[PDB]
Amino acid sequence: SHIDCRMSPWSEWSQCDPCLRQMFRSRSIEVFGQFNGKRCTDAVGDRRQCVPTEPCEDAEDDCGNDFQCSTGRCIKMRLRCNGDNDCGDFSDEDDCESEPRPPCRDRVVEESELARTAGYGINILGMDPLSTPFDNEFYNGLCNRDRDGNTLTYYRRPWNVASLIYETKGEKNFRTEHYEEEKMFLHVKGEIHLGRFVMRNRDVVLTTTFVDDIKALPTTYEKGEYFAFLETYGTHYSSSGSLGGLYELIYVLDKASMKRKGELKDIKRCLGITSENLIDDVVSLIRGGTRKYAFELKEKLLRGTVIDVTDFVNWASSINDAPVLISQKLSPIYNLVPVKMKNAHLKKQNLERAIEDYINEFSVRKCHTCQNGGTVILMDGKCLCACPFKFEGIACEIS
Amino acid sequence: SHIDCRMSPWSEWSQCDPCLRQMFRSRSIEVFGQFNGKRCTDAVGDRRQCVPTEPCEDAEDDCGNDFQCSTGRCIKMRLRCNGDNDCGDFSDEDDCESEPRPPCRDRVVEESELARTAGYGINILGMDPLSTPFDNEFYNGLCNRDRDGNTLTYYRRPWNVASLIYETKGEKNFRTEHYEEQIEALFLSYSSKKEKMFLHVKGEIHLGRFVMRNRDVVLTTTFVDDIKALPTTYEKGEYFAFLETYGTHYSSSGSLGGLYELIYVLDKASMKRKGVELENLIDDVVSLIRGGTRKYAFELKEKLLRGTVIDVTDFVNWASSINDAPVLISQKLSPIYNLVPVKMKNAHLKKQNLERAIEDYINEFSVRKCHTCQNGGTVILMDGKCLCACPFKFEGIACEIS
Amino acid sequence: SHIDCRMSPWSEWSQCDPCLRQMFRSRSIEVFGQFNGKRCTDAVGDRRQCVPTEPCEDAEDDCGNDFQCSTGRCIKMRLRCNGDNDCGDFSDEDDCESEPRPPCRDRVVEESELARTAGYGINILGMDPLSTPFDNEFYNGLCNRDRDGNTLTYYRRPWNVASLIYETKGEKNFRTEHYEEQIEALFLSYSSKKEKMFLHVKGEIHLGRFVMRNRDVVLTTTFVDDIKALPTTYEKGEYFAFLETYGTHYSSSGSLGGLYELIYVLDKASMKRKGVELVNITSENLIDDVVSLIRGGTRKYAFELKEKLLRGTVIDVTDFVNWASSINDAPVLISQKLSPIYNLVPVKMKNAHLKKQNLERAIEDYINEFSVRKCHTCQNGGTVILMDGKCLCACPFKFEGIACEIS
Ligand SMILES: *[C@@H]1O[C@H](CO)[C@@H](O[C@@H]2O[C@H](CO)[C@@H](O)[C@H](O)[C@@H]2NC(C)=O)[C@H](O)[C@H]1NC(C)=O
Ligand SMILES: *[C@@H]1O[C@H](CO)[C@@H](O[C@@H]2O[C@H](CO)[C@@H](O)[C@H](O)[C@H]2NC(C)=O)[C@H](O)[C@H]1NC(C)=O
């Protein structure tokens, strides 16, 4: 049967760490859950506030030659009269003596909907409550810019974006492969690429929240607190990626079932069925584009219309409204630790430890194998099995 | 099992290099892991803040006979009050009290987006195009111009662009091959039926061709500042970070345009044999379109995935929109290190190190150090892991089965 | 195996060029990287800053009684005060404040774009046209008006272009060939059906020829400056970069025009084959291959015609005329007479002859150094092609692969 959560008490309770004023704790989680059994919900480490064991050492260094930005994110003093909110709170612009001289002194340029989102954090297991640690609204007082050819609108390239390239690149693929001696496969893939981005490797400007949480992390391997940070910002960020939207469909039969369910010439005529049912529940995936267009696309195609070229074009236009990531290269978020931060490298190593422990703990091997065979899966808080090869039950108990 | 990725140890720390106030370590990627081995997402470089051993030998230097802007670029005095932005800045222009004589002296002339974006940086891995290292708003106080041609409008050619012709070409190739064979006959007897058709359609539009000046080039202030920040001692991770920020090459010339292609292939067979001694089907269709605006490109993508003969109006609409959204349909690569300016501190040493960094980057991300495909499929170095693909029935994460 | 490309060792460093503050190295391309080896993208030459070992022998010269502009060009005094910009940045005209006299007395004259672009630079490697090295905005104080001919608009012929004649020509050339056979017959026996068709169509339009002036020719300031900024010693990479930015030749004459072309070929064969050794075979193969090309003219008409051309559709002459008329707006250099770019290196310049010779030699080495000759042979005698930094061959038959290694 399903297995309920199994847990341990906190195995440790720390000293009242000097700058933190907390007695942190560590516990363990023994079994999240299995076969849809009751997930665990407790934190893998508690903590307690406490009067600190010693005076805090932060003694924070002022910006000095840099502008004394209200949030402490020191900036080139020239950026006080930026007119550009290089400080976190316009205190640059407010401390300018009403001497506006914005970047793109004469030119007209906008801010990209996408570049604000560029440099997505990613939990390799999930997704992050704050999409980016990058503050993609810094410009260092430049106005590098790219043109959307679809509108001739210029957008500023925010300083963390080392490259931005809008590019129409449509791809579509349709494949069928079928043997009997017996199998059938049908595949459809549709990629609407929209643009490349690349993130700067150096001098990145982060959100004040992120550097505050880096100050909140101790130089100790505060494993549970490091995990709490990591779930705030993911295991990696994306340093390059392709944005836009995609859809994907497959239809798969036995070769004998293909000939009965079939005429392949009618299937092609639907590409370029009304008497059949089993053609209806094809696999379908849509990502990006405004949900209305994806819904009506599904409602037509699952009812087995021919391919509505106009609905596909309308969804592609909707991708301009609701773009999504198509592919990325990831880099671990510890690379974002500012090199001048106190104990920066130590915190970076403790982050690498946290990452490795994250992988080690949430590997599916924490749960049992299925009661007969097939695939074991981990859902968040509980494992399960799936066995589509004519097996059944929450553990594939039946075949 | 598959083999997960693996990495070397870290190097020792470098010395604490002056001015940059850091020490560094290096860590080669031993294996990416074929067979869907666990990815190596992790950084090859490490760096730590350090108090330097000795005073900073300043990277900054004087510009005597040249106006030193607020950006670090020093320009000939003739370019002050030139009316053009010659520094990525207006420190050359905001000072100006009088006689802002523009070098295009009372003639109408536009910017060209072809010129502004010309010279794209390129990562040789995947040929991914990148922002141009050149500053294409600098005109050296000249007024070289040519016509956009299809419209009778002149645009000003930026100093970094030595040529930019606007030749209209249209090309289109259409090829079809079809084969059917039947053979009938140890004593051996045959019944076999084979059917193959190959249909290949590709068409090209050329918008123009640029060529880059390569001596006296003027580069973005960010790019030269990043070269200043680059360490002299070949800290490989920092050089790889630079190469990924800017790519390893720039297009020193290329054609802008737009492209589309369509392939249809079918093989169908019924093979049998008997003898005396003492069905499979594959179809695939792929349509690719590059450049032009979304609407027309994707409408053609639909109308080309259909076998319907396209309306020439749609083709011409896409062709026109290619002027709005061209693609670098071809380029000639030049190594990015040639853009490293002479007359800069350790510039030649940095060039040496950049060449070594490009070598190591190509090697360190070589698929060559991934295990073979089982059935000889094309081995793919994806992000941090290796795999292979096979066209034949042999299939799976290494084509292990069939 | 693939064969990774290979390069020479660096040459020795040159001496420091006393005026150029620089020293240089050369590096031959030993092997291009056949069979999709490593690409040899690395630079053929390298240069290093040097504090010079001796004083510069200055590159400036005294033009004497000639006006010496803000740019290095020197011009005869009468060209001052022309109203025409006879030098860089009107410096010949900013030298003038009173009694301006345009040689186009009492009239306005159009600037011809075809004259402005005439004298295209050319690189022999793909015959790509580069920009004209000529300064076609120099009239030398003349007002030679010519008609556009396709239009009555009169334009002032610039001094460099000795002739621009709208010697209009139009051509259409058409050929079709059709061949068909049916043949019916240890030993081998076969019966066959065979059909061959070829169709070839090209049309040319000529808008006119330019002839560049043999003598007294005035060049752009950047061109002459780039000849000044040249090592005087032979320095493979520095002259190669010059030829790469200007081309090894210029059109001393050329015809502007437009061109379209359509090729259609069909080959169809049917074979039946039976063999006996001291088998029965049936085969059908069809090959159908169509290519359509248009060059010049405005995109709208060029592409509309080219699509209507590619289809079996009969072209309405009105659209063909609209394209041929738009060729007046966007011509293409359909032909040229090539002169070596070093013939533009002006006599009466410091080391002029030596730089001529050095460019001659650099062009020699450039032809040689990027010669496909040193690629490996094709395995099936297909055409070896030098790509950017890698070399291969292609073959049209069933023998196929990156070197046609299989069939
Ligand atoms: C040699 O092979 C021929 C095919 O490869 C074969 O022709 C076939 O004959 C069938 C009747 O026996 C007929 O139904 C089928 O259409 C077919 N025809 C063609 C054009 O392929 C010949 O009969 C065979 N020769 C002998 C002597 O058996
Ligand atoms: C030359 O071009 C004209 C214009 O396209 C063609 O004129 C057509 O002539 C046919 C009869 O030959 C008529 O049926 C059409 O109505 C005409 N069209 C127009 C617009 O007038 C003419 O046919 C062409 N001739 C040749 C030999 O190609």
Coordinates of C-alpha atoms in Angstrom, one line a residue, chain C:
Chain C
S1 CA 39.8 9.7 -40.3
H2 CA 39.1 13.4 -40.8
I3 CA 42.4 15.4 -41.3
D4 CA 42.7 18.3 -38.9
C5 CA 44.0 21.5 -40.6
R6 CA 47.6 22.6 -39.9
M7 CA 49.5 25.8 -39.9
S8 CA 53.1 26.9 -40.2
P9 CA 55.1 28.0 -37.2
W10 CA 55.1 31.7 -36.7
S11 CA 57.6 33.5 -38.8
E12 CA 60.3 35.4 -37.0
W13 CA 59.2 38.8 -35.8
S14 CA 59.9 41.6 -38.2
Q15 CA 61.9 44.5 -37.2
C16 CA 59.9 47.4 -35.7
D17 CA 58.5 49.6 -38.5
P18 CA 59.8 53.0 -37.3
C19 CA 56.7 55.0 -38.4
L20 CA 54.1 52.2 -37.6
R21 CA 55.3 51.4 -34.1
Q22 CA 54.7 47.8 -34.9
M23 CA 56.3 44.4 -35.6
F24 CA 54.7 41.5 -37.5
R25 CA 54.7 37.8 -38.1
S26 CA 53.6 35.5 -40.9
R27 CA 52.0 32.0 -40.7
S28 CA 51.4 29.8 -43.8
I29 CA 48.3 27.6 -43.9
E30 CA 49.9 24.1 -44.3
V31 CA 46.6 22.2 -44.6
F32 CA 43.1 23.5 -44.8
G33 CA 41.4 20.7 -42.7
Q34 CA 40.0 18.4 -45.3
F35 CA 37.2 15.9 -44.5
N36 CA 35.7 18.2 -41.9
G37 CA 38.8 18.3 -39.8
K38 CA 39.6 21.2 -37.5
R39 CA 38.9 24.5 -39.3
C40 CA 41.9 26.8 -39.7
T41 CA 40.2 30.0 -38.7
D42 CA 43.3 31.3 -37.0
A43 CA 44.8 34.5 -38.4
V44 CA 47.4 34.2 -41.1
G45 CA 49.3 37.2 -39.6
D46 CA 50.0 38.8 -36.3
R47 CA 51.4 42.1 -35.1
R48 CA 52.8 43.6 -31.9
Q49 CA 53.3 47.1 -30.5
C50 CA 56.9 48.2 -30.5
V51 CA 58.7 51.3 -29.2
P52 CA 60.6 52.2 -32.5
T53 CA 64.3 51.6 -32.7
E54 CA 64.9 54.6 -35.0
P55 CA 63.1 57.9 -35.9
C56 CA 60.3 57.8 -38.4
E57 CA 61.1 59.0 -41.9
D58 CA 57.9 61.0 -42.1
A59 CA 55.0 60.0 -44.4
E60 CA 54.0 63.6 -44.9
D61 CA 55.2 65.4 -47.9
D62 CA 55.3 69.1 -49.1
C63 CA 52.7 69.6 -51.9
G64 CA 54.3 73.0 -52.6
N65 CA 52.0 75.4 -54.4
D66 CA 49.1 72.9 -54.2
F67 CA 46.4 73.4 -51.7
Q68 CA 46.8 70.9 -48.9
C69 CA 43.5 70.0 -47.4
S70 CA 42.6 69.0 -43.9
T71 CA 42.8 65.5 -45.2
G72 CA 46.1 64.5 -46.9
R73 CA 44.9 65.2 -50.4
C74 CA 46.4 68.1 -52.3
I75 CA 44.5 69.8 -55.2
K76 CA 45.0 72.6 -57.6
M77 CA 44.0 76.0 -56.5
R78 CA 41.2 76.5 -59.1
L79 CA 39.3 73.7 -57.4
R80 CA 39.1 75.8 -54.3
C81 CA 35.9 77.9 -54.2
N82 CA 34.1 75.7 -56.7
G83 CA 31.1 75.2 -54.4
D84 CA 31.7 71.6 -55.2
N85 CA 33.3 69.6 -52.4
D86 CA 36.6 68.9 -54.2
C87 CA 38.4 67.6 -51.1
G88 CA 37.6 66.1 -47.7
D89 CA 35.0 67.9 -45.6
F90 CA 34.7 70.9 -48.0
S91 CA 38.1 72.0 -46.8
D92 CA 38.8 73.2 -50.3
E93 CA 35.5 75.2 -50.0
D94 CA 36.0 76.3 -46.4
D95 CA 39.2 77.7 -47.7
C96 CA 36.9 79.9 -49.8
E97 CA 34.8 82.8 -48.5
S98 CA 34.1 85.0 -51.5
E99 CA 33.4 85.0 -55.3
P100 CA 32.2 81.4 -55.4
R101 CA 31.8 80.2 -59.0
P102 CA 30.2 76.8 -59.7
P103 CA 31.3 75.3 -63.1
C104 CA 27.7 74.3 -63.4
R105 CA 27.0 78.0 -64.0
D106 CA 23.3 79.0 -63.8
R107 CA 22.0 75.5 -63.6
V108 CA 21.3 72.5 -61.3
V109 CA 22.6 69.0 -62.2
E110 CA 21.7 65.7 -60.7
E111 CA 24.2 63.4 -59.0
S112 CA 24.1 60.0 -60.8
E113 CA 24.1 57.0 -58.4
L114 CA 25.6 54.8 -61.1
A115 CA 28.5 57.2 -61.5
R116 CA 28.9 57.4 -57.7
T117 CA 29.3 53.6 -57.4
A118 CA 31.4 53.1 -60.6
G119 CA 34.9 51.6 -60.2
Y120 CA 33.8 48.8 -57.8
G121 CA 36.5 47.1 -55.9
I122 CA 36.6 43.4 -56.6
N123 CA 38.1 40.4 -54.8
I124 CA 39.1 37.7 -57.2
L125 CA 38.1 35.1 -54.6
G126 CA 34.4 34.8 -55.5
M127 CA 34.6 38.0 -57.6
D128 CA 32.6 39.8 -54.9
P129 CA 32.4 43.5 -55.7
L130 CA 33.7 45.8 -53.0
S131 CA 33.0 49.6 -52.8
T132 CA 34.7 51.8 -55.4
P133 CA 38.1 53.2 -54.3
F134 CA 37.4 56.2 -56.5
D135 CA 36.1 59.5 -55.2
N136 CA 33.3 59.9 -57.7
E137 CA 32.1 63.1 -56.0
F138 CA 35.2 64.9 -57.6
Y139 CA 34.2 66.8 -60.8
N140 CA 37.6 68.6 -61.2
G141 CA 35.5 71.7 -61.9
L142 CA 33.7 70.4 -65.0
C143 CA 29.9 70.2 -65.7
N144 CA 29.7 67.4 -68.2
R145 CA 25.9 66.7 -68.2
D146 CA 24.6 63.4 -69.5
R147 CA 21.0 62.1 -69.7
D148 CA 20.1 59.1 -67.7
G149 CA 18.8 58.0 -71.1
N150 CA 16.2 55.7 -69.5
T151 CA 15.1 59.1 -68.1
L152 CA 15.6 62.7 -69.3
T153 CA 17.1 63.7 -66.0
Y154 CA 20.6 65.2 -66.8
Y155 CA 23.4 64.2 -64.4
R156 CA 27.0 65.5 -64.0
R157 CA 29.5 62.9 -65.0
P158 CA 32.3 62.8 -62.3
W159 CA 35.9 63.3 -63.3
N160 CA 36.9 59.6 -62.7
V161 CA 34.3 58.2 -65.0
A162 CA 35.6 58.9 -68.5
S163 CA 32.4 57.4 -70.0
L164 CA 29.0 56.3 -68.7
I165 CA 27.0 55.3 -71.8
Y166 CA 23.5 53.9 -71.6
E167 CA 24.2 51.5 -74.4
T168 CA 21.1 49.6 -73.6
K169 CA 20.7 46.0 -74.7
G170 CA 18.1 43.3 -74.0
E171 CA 18.4 39.6 -74.7
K172 CA 16.4 36.5 -74.3
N173 CA 18.1 33.2 -75.2
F174 CA 16.1 29.9 -75.2
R175 CA 17.1 26.3 -75.9
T176 CA 15.2 23.0 -75.5
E177 CA 16.5 19.5 -76.2
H178 CA 14.4 16.4 -76.0
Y179 CA 15.7 12.8 -76.5
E180 CA 13.8 9.5 -76.2
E181 CA 14.6 5.8 -76.8
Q182 CA 13.0 2.5 -76.3
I183 CA 15.3 -0.6 -76.5
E184 CA 14.4 -4.3 -76.4
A185 CA 17.0 -7.0 -76.7
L186 CA 27.6 -16.7 -68.2
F187 CA 25.5 -14.0 -69.9
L188 CA 23.8 -10.7 -69.1
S189 CA 20.7 -9.4 -70.8
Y190 CA 18.7 -6.2 -70.3
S191 CA 16.0 -4.1 -71.9
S192 CA 15.6 -0.4 -71.3
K193 CA 13.6 2.7 -71.8
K194 CA 15.4 6.0 -71.8
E195 CA 14.3 9.7 -72.1
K196 CA 16.4 12.9 -71.7
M197 CA 15.1 16.5 -71.7
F198 CA 17.1 19.7 -71.3
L199 CA 15.7 23.2 -71.1
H200 CA 17.8 26.4 -70.7
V201 CA 16.5 29.9 -70.5
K202 CA 18.4 33.1 -69.6
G203 CA 17.8 36.7 -70.3
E204 CA 20.1 39.7 -70.0
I205 CA 19.6 43.4 -69.8
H206 CA 22.4 45.9 -70.1
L207 CA 21.9 49.4 -68.6
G208 CA 25.2 50.8 -69.7
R209 CA 28.9 50.7 -69.3
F210 CA 31.2 52.8 -67.3
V211 CA 34.9 53.3 -68.3
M212 CA 37.1 54.6 -65.5
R213 CA 39.7 57.3 -66.5
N214 CA 43.0 55.7 -67.3
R215 CA 44.9 58.8 -65.9
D216 CA 44.7 61.7 -63.5
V217 CA 42.4 59.6 -61.3
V218 CA 41.5 60.8 -57.8
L219 CA 41.0 58.3 -55.0
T220 CA 39.2 58.3 -51.7
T221 CA 41.1 59.7 -48.7
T222 CA 40.7 56.5 -46.8
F223 CA 42.2 54.4 -49.6
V224 CA 45.4 56.5 -49.9
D225 CA 45.6 56.7 -46.1
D226 CA 45.4 52.8 -46.0
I227 CA 48.3 52.8 -48.5
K228 CA 50.3 55.1 -46.2
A229 CA 49.5 52.9 -43.2
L230 CA 51.4 50.0 -44.8
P231 CA 54.7 48.5 -43.6
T232 CA 56.9 49.2 -46.6
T233 CA 58.5 45.9 -45.8
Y234 CA 56.6 42.9 -47.1
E235 CA 54.4 41.7 -44.2
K236 CA 52.0 39.0 -45.5
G237 CA 49.2 39.6 -43.1
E238 CA 49.1 43.4 -43.4
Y239 CA 48.8 43.3 -47.2
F240 CA 46.4 40.4 -47.0
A241 CA 44.2 42.6 -44.7
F242 CA 44.5 45.4 -47.2
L243 CA 43.5 43.2 -50.1
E244 CA 40.7 41.8 -48.0
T245 CA 39.3 45.2 -47.3
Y246 CA 39.8 46.7 -50.8
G247 CA 40.0 43.7 -53.1
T248 CA 42.8 42.6 -55.3
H249 CA 41.3 44.3 -58.4
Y250 CA 39.0 47.1 -59.4
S251 CA 36.7 47.2 -62.4
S252 CA 38.4 49.6 -64.7
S253 CA 35.3 49.1 -66.8
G254 CA 32.0 47.3 -66.3
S255 CA 28.5 46.9 -67.6
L256 CA 25.6 47.4 -65.2
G257 CA 22.4 45.5 -65.9
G258 CA 20.0 42.9 -64.7
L259 CA 19.9 39.2 -65.3
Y260 CA 17.5 36.3 -65.0
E261 CA 17.9 32.6 -65.7
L262 CA 15.9 29.4 -65.6
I263 CA 17.2 25.9 -66.1
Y264 CA 15.1 22.7 -66.3
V265 CA 16.4 19.2 -66.7
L266 CA 14.5 15.9 -66.6
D267 CA 16.1 12.4 -67.1
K268 CA 13.9 9.3 -67.0
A269 CA 15.0 5.7 -67.4
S270 CA 13.4 2.3 -67.0
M271 CA 15.5 -0.9 -66.9
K272 CA 14.8 -4.7 -66.8
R273 CA 17.8 -6.9 -66.2
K274 CA 18.5 -10.6 -66.0
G275 CA 21.9 -12.3 -65.4
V276 CA 23.2 -15.9 -65.3
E277 CA 26.5 -17.1 -64.0
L278 CA 28.2 -20.3 -65.3
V279 CA 18.6 -13.1 -61.4
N280 CA 15.6 -11.0 -62.5
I281 CA 15.5 -7.3 -61.9
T282 CA 13.0 -4.4 -62.5
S283 CA 13.9 -0.8 -61.8
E284 CA 12.4 2.7 -62.2
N285 CA 14.3 6.0 -61.7
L286 CA 13.2 9.6 -62.2
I287 CA 15.3 12.7 -61.8
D288 CA 13.7 16.2 -62.1
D289 CA 15.8 19.3 -61.3
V290 CA 14.7 23.0 -61.6
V291 CA 16.7 26.1 -60.7
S292 CA 15.5 29.7 -61.0
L293 CA 17.8 32.8 -60.6
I294 CA 17.2 36.5 -60.8
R295 CA 19.7 39.3 -60.2
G296 CA 19.1 43.1 -60.0
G297 CA 15.9 45.1 -60.1
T298 CA 13.7 46.1 -57.2
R299 CA 12.7 43.2 -54.9
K300 CA 9.0 43.4 -55.5
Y301 CA 9.2 43.0 -59.3
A302 CA 12.4 40.9 -59.3
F303 CA 10.8 38.3 -57.0
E304 CA 7.3 38.4 -58.6
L305 CA 8.8 37.8 -62.0
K306 CA 11.2 35.1 -60.6
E307 CA 8.3 33.2 -59.1
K308 CA 6.1 33.6 -62.1
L309 CA 9.1 32.6 -64.2
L310 CA 9.7 29.4 -62.1
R311 CA 6.1 28.2 -62.5
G312 CA 5.0 27.1 -65.9
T313 CA 2.9 30.3 -65.8
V314 CA 3.1 32.4 -68.9
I315 CA 4.7 35.8 -67.9
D316 CA 2.6 38.9 -68.8
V317 CA 5.2 41.2 -70.5
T318 CA 4.0 44.0 -68.4
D319 CA 5.6 42.5 -65.3
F320 CA 8.8 41.8 -67.2
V321 CA 8.9 45.4 -68.4
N322 CA 8.3 46.6 -64.8
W323 CA 11.3 44.6 -63.6
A324 CA 13.5 45.7 -66.5
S325 CA 12.5 49.3 -65.8
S326 CA 13.3 48.9 -62.1
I327 CA 16.8 47.7 -63.1
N328 CA 17.4 51.4 -63.5
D329 CA 17.1 51.7 -59.7
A330 CA 19.1 48.7 -58.5
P331 CA 21.6 47.6 -61.1
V332 CA 24.1 44.8 -60.7
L333 CA 27.7 44.6 -62.1
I334 CA 27.1 41.9 -64.7
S335 CA 30.6 42.2 -66.2
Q336 CA 33.9 44.0 -65.6
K337 CA 37.4 44.5 -66.9
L338 CA 39.8 43.8 -63.9
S339 CA 42.9 45.8 -63.3
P340 CA 45.2 45.0 -60.3
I341 CA 44.4 47.2 -57.3
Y342 CA 48.1 48.2 -57.1
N343 CA 47.7 50.1 -60.3
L344 CA 45.7 52.6 -58.2
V345 CA 48.7 53.1 -55.9
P346 CA 49.7 56.6 -57.0
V347 CA 53.0 57.5 -58.5
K348 CA 54.5 60.4 -56.6
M349 CA 54.2 58.8 -53.2
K350 CA 56.8 57.6 -50.7
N351 CA 57.9 54.1 -51.6
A352 CA 55.0 54.0 -54.1
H353 CA 56.8 51.5 -56.4
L354 CA 57.9 49.3 -53.5
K355 CA 54.3 49.2 -52.2
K356 CA 53.2 48.3 -55.7
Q357 CA 55.7 45.4 -55.9
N358 CA 54.7 44.3 -52.3
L359 CA 51.0 44.3 -53.3
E360 CA 51.8 42.3 -56.4
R361 CA 53.6 39.7 -54.2
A362 CA 50.9 39.7 -51.6
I363 CA 48.3 39.0 -54.3
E364 CA 50.5 36.2 -55.6
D365 CA 50.7 34.7 -52.1
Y366 CA 47.0 35.2 -51.5
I367 CA 46.0 33.4 -54.7
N368 CA 48.4 30.7 -53.7
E369 CA 47.8 30.6 -49.9
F370 CA 44.0 30.2 -50.3
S371 CA 44.4 27.9 -53.3
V372 CA 42.3 24.7 -53.1
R373 CA 45.4 23.1 -54.8
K374 CA 46.6 21.9 -51.4
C375 CA 43.4 20.2 -50.4
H376 CA 43.3 16.4 -50.7
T377 CA 41.8 14.9 -53.8
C378 CA 38.1 13.9 -54.0
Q379 CA 37.8 10.2 -53.7
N380 CA 35.4 10.1 -56.7
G381 CA 36.8 13.0 -58.6
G382 CA 34.0 15.4 -57.6
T383 CA 34.7 19.1 -57.4
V384 CA 36.9 20.0 -54.4
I385 CA 35.5 23.1 -52.8
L386 CA 37.3 25.4 -50.3
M387 CA 34.7 26.5 -47.7
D388 CA 35.5 29.1 -45.1
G389 CA 38.4 27.5 -43.3
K390 CA 37.6 23.9 -44.3
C391 CA 37.9 22.0 -47.5
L392 CA 35.7 19.2 -49.0
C393 CA 34.4 17.9 -52.3
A394 CA 30.9 17.1 -53.7
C395 CA 29.8 14.6 -56.2
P396 CA 26.4 14.4 -58.0
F397 CA 26.2 10.6 -58.5
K398 CA 25.2 7.8 -56.1
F399 CA 28.8 8.0 -54.9
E400 CA 28.3 10.3 -52.0
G401 CA 29.6 11.4 -48.6
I402 CA 31.8 14.2 -47.4
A403 CA 34.6 13.0 -49.7
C404 CA 32.3 10.8 -51.9
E405 CA 34.0 7.9 -50.1
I406 CA 31.0 5.5 -50.7
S407 CA 28.4 4.6 -53.3

